[PDB]
Amino acid sequence: QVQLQESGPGLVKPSETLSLTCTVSGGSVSSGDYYWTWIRQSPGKGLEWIGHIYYSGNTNYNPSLKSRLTISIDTSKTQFSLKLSSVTAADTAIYYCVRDRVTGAFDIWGQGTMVTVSSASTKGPSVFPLAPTAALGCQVEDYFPEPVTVSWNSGALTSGVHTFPAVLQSSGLYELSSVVTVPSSSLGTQTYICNVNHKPSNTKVDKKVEP
Amino acid sequence: DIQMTQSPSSLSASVGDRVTITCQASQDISNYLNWYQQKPGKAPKLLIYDASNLETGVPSRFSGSGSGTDFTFTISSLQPEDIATYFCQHFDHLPLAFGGGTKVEIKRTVAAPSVFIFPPSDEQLKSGRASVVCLLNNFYPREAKVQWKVDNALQSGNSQESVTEQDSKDSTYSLSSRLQLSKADYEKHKVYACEVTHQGLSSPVTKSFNRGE
Ligand SMILES: [Br-]
Ligand SMILES: [Br-]
Ligand SMILES: [Br-]
């Protein structure tokens, strides 16, 4: 079972170039049955097919992005890449690398990566406890850009966890909460740690929540 | 350059219902039509290819049909984990294009929320900000009204809300309302109240605290 995964900056400045790389792991990129494709998704233009590349070196690209598009392939590292030139805020989207059967079907997608086009620089989040069934959580704020991942006790605690969509602050940075409900008796024995990871700034914060 | 029109743009149906969404191509595309399902926070997943072929590893309740210009996606019996946005995709000719998407939410019985109010931690106050957070847990329907009262004074324009996607097990929503203030403004008052109006609450529910206590 093949898996695809994107890597690259979550934040790129205007007039700069967006460079994304897909790592095809578990399978060979030198297969004739598939087209190695990029697709993005944003609120202003929905799901949008960007283009693809065949293992023989041939591309196609979407005519709407014909000018600033460059899709390469690297059979040595089983990677294929994407380059988008002189980006604007309209290029802010979630970008996916996708396996497309030659018969025509996007049967394997990557998880996707969020790309924000902004002149501002990254900032790691501040994490503050939401202390006390009983409800507790973590306040994650003062970060940019999206996204942040929040896990509880390194993934051991997953039931009843709710991580809310971030909203904007007056500063223009993001802010969210991650909450989880627990039995009120566990507050004297069990410790609860929220694990906040912010890749665009390479910021990891573990925060202990106590009564 | 084909135009893919999906209908409706969103719908809600009860568990066990037969859901049917349509995709109309702006020209004949034979059976060059695929169906995708995008669960919350995930990438789209292939369900139907060639307008009617079920993908391996997909439940039998999903199916597709149609050819030429009109295509219908169908869920024979709607299940709790079937909540997602569904897209049609043509591969008649480049460029490949998706439809606008059909969001499928689930109608379930009413459920009142569990309400919790969180004062800002002393650690947040050291940064200079103060967010008073009110939590509404596991309710339905999605519609909820949260009013903030500071010393019995209604607040307006200084709070933000945030609601999770509908849960794939119990089909409920959870909501977060935060009163965004500065340390200076937050420490000028005592009573911070969160009042909730919801279809499952016969009378509104207020959760409050005194600053400090
Ligand atoms: Br997030
Ligand atoms: Br760092
Ligand atoms: Br084709």
Report CB contact under 8 Å: A165, B164: yes
CB proximity under 8 Å: B 39-68 to A: 42-46, 49, 55
DSSP letter for B81, please: G
Strands laid side by side in the B70-75 sheet = B4-7, B19-25, B70-75, B62-67
The alpha helices in B71-145, defined as continuous H runs, are 122-127
Q: Which residues pair with B197 in a beta bridge?
A: B145
Q: Which residues pair with A113 in a beta bridge?
A: A95
**H-helix or E-strand containing B186?**
helix B183-186
| Interface probe, candidates B86, B96, B207, chain A, greatest A C-beta count within 10 A | B96
Q: Which residues pair with B105 in a beta bridge?
A: B12
How many angstroms separate the CA atoms of A38 and A177, rounded? 32
Q: Could you tell me if B206 and B134 lie in one domain?
A: yes
Domain residue limits at B142 = 114-210
Size of interface A-B (CB pairs under 8 A): 112
Q: Could you tell me if B137 and B75 lie in one domain?
A: no
Q: Does A142 touch chain B (CB under 8 A)?
A: yes
Resolution of this model in Å is 2.3
Q: What residues are neighbours of ligand 1 (ion), with CB under 5 Å?
A: A 147-148
Q: Of B68, B87, B107, which marks where a domain is finished? A: B107
Structural domains of chain A sorted by starting position, each given as residue range(s) with its CATH number in brackets: 3-117 (2.60.40.10), 126-209 (2.60.40.10)
Q: And the tokens for A120?
A: 């501002």
**H-helix or E-strand containing A192?**
strand A192-198
Q: And the tokens for A136?
A: 């507790």
Q: Could you tell me if B101 and B8 lie in one domain?
A: yes
Q: Could you tell me if B70 and B92 lie in one domain?
A: yes
CATH at residue B136: 2.60.40.10
Q: Could you tell me if B147 and B93 lie in one domain?
A: no
Q: Which residues of A52-75 are buried (b: 16+ CB within 10 A; e: fewer)?
A: bbebeeebbbbeebeeebebebee
Q: Which residues pair with A96 in a beta bridge?
A: A39
DSSP letter for A110, please: -
Residue with tokens 């009142």: B112
Residue type, A18: L
With contact defined as beta carbons under 8 Å apart, do B37 and B45 qualify?
Answer: yes
SS3 state of residue A114: strand
The alpha helices in chain A, defined as continuous H runs, are none
Give the residue on A whose Cα is nearest the Cα of B125. A128
Q: What radius of gyration do chain A's Cα atoms show?
A: 20
Tell me, in angstroms, the distance from the centre of ligand 2 to residue A202's CA: 5
How many angstroms separate the CA atoms of A128 and B86, rounded? 37
Q: Could you tell me if B103 and B152 lie in one domain?
A: no
With contact defined as beta carbons under 8 Å apart, do B102 and B95 qualify?
Answer: no
With contact defined as beta carbons under 8 Å apart, do B100 and B5 qualify?
Answer: yes
How many angstroms separate the CA atoms of B194 and B208, rounded? 6
How many angstroms separate the CA atoms of A115 and B42, rounded? 16
A150 to each of A87, A103, A161, A198, how far by Cα in Å? Answer: 29, 39, 10, 9
Q: Does B180 touch chain A (CB under 8 A)?
A: yes
Q: And the tokens for A199?
A: 């890749």
Cβ-based contacts of B55 with chain A (< 8 Å) = 107
**H-helix or E-strand containing A48?**
strand A46-53
Q: Which of A48, A110, A131 sits opposite B121 (nearest CB)?
A: A131
Q: And the tokens for B211?
A: 């600053």
Q: Could you tell me if B17 and B68 lie in one domain?
A: yes
Q: Could you tell me if B83 and B157 lie in one domain?
A: no
Tell me, in angstroms, the distance from the centre of ligand 2 to residue A144's CA: 14
The bridge status of strand A149-152 relative to strand A192-198 is antiparallel
* Exposed/middle/buried for residue A134 (C-beta within 10 Å: 0-12, 13-18, 19+): middle
Q: Which residues pair with A6 in a beta bridge?
A: A22
Q: Could you tell me if B86 and B147 lie in one domain?
A: no
Q: Could you tell me if B96 and B191 lie in one domain?
A: no
The alpha carbon of residue B16 is apart from the nearest alpha carbon of chain A, in Å, by 25
A65 to each of A80, A86, A102, B74, B89, how far by Cα in Å? Answer: 18, 12, 22, 34, 19
Q: Of B107, B142, B164, which marks where a domain is finished? A: B107
Question: Could you give the number of structural domains in chain B?
Answer: 2
DSSP letter for B183, please: H
How many angstroms separate the CA atoms of A116 and A114, rounded? 7
DSSP letter for A94, please: E
DSSP letter for B126, please: H
How many angstroms separate the CA atoms of B122 and B183, rounded? 10
For residue B119, say if its preceding peptide bond is cis, omega within 30 degrees of 0: no
With contact defined as beta carbons under 8 Å apart, do B23 and B99 qualify?
Answer: yes
Q: Could you tell me if B15 and B60 lie in one domain?
A: yes
- Structure solved using which method? X-ray
How many angstroms separate the CA atoms of A23 and A204, rounded? 24
- State CA B174 to chain mean position distance: 10
Q: Could you tell me if B123 and B201 lie in one domain?
A: yes
Q: Of B107, B128, B147, which marks where a domain is finished? A: B107
